Amino acid sequence: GSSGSSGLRSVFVSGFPRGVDSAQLSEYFLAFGPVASVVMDKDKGVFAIVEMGDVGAREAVLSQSQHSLGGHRLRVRPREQKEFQSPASKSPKG
Numbered sequence: 001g002s003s004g005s006s007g008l009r010s011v012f013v014s015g016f017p018r019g020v021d022s023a024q025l026s027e028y029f030l031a032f033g034p035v036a037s038v039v040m041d042k043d044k045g046v047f048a049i050v051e052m053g054d055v056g057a058r059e060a061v062l063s064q065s066q067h068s069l070g071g072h073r074l075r076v077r078p079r080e081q082k083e084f085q086s087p088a089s090k091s092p093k094g
Contacts, residue, residue, distance in 0.1 A: 008079055009055045011062075013038075014047040015075035025050065028069055033057025049079070 013025065022038035029035045029050055034057055040048035052058040058078070061067075067076045 004059075006055050009052050009058045010079050011050045011052065011058055012047065012077045012079040012081065013050045013074060015073065016048070016069060017072050020069065022048070025069070029061070032060040032064070 013029075016025070022040050025038045025040070025048060026035040029038075029052075034053035036051035036053055038048050038050055052061075061076065062078055064076075067074050
């Protein structure tokens with residue numbers, strides 16, 4: 001929920017310009033931690049699933065001020081999609 005939650009050691013990166021490759025991206029994401037790989041769509045090439053070695057690594061990215069890939073801006077996100085929302089109300093009994 002709140003800041004700091006182990007479970008997803010990956011991040012969703014997109015919004016990159018034309019020319020960017022998987023190898024490059026990874027290298028750029030190595031300044032924070034060890035990247036497993038970059039699964040970028042080949043059919044079209046719009047989004048890329050950036051994987052990380054350990055949970056900490058992925059966390060080091062979330063705790064970053066601003067991200068950029070050689071000037072251009074990147075919409076780096078903690079792979080937070082299709083998030084189910086609902087009024088979770090409940091209280092414990094003495």
